[PDB]
Amino acid sequence: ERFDAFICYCPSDIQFVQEMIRQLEQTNYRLKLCVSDRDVLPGTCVWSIASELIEKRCRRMVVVVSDDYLQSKECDFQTKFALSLSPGAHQKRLIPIKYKAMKKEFPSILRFITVCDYTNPCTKSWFWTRLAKALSLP
């Protein structure tokens, strides 16, 4: 009922979401992620439970940013709603992930939040340690 983070993803990035489940749930971090295609029951109002899960039942929200995520309206809503809870990002609530290269622009409304970048080969080592640490805090 209480998760550590809600995972905002478009269907195309399900591969990386499952890699996240392996890396954060099924290891010593013992984190509890909310994945809509696994944990959200059918018959729920896509907007009502999105709002209910992200605001009350999930402590933070991780957003998987890609070219395909920009074309998702379900994600767009979820991201703008996540930003509403801390416009200034004082609560360190919205966690942007970049896992692969993007031909298109990083969302304008997210441009002053520290991205967990998995593309840069020189920083990749600290990606999982930093992300797990971010989700583990109150």
Residue numbers in the entry: 159 to 296
What does the paper say about this structure?
We previously observed that the TIR domain of MAL (MALTIR) forms filaments in vitro and induces formation of crystalline higher-order assemblies of the MyD88 TIR domain (MyD88TIR).
Here we present MicroED and SFX structures of the MAL-induced MyD88TIR microcrystals at 3.0 Å and 2.3 Å resolution, respectively. The SFXa map showed well-resolved features, including water molecules that were not modelled in the MicroED structure. The structure of MyD88TIR within the MAL-induced higher-order assembly exhibited conformational differences from the known NMR (RMSD of 2.4 Å for 107 Cα atoms)61 and X-ray (RMSD of 2.0 Å for 118 Cα atoms)62 structures of monomeric MyD88TIR. Based on the SFX structure, the intrastrand interface involves opposite sides of the MyD88TIR domain, which together buries ~18.0–18.6% (1500 Å2) of the total surface area per subunit in the structure. It is composed of interactions between residues located in the BB loop of one subunit (BB surface) and the βD and βE strands and the αE helix on the next subunit (EE surface).
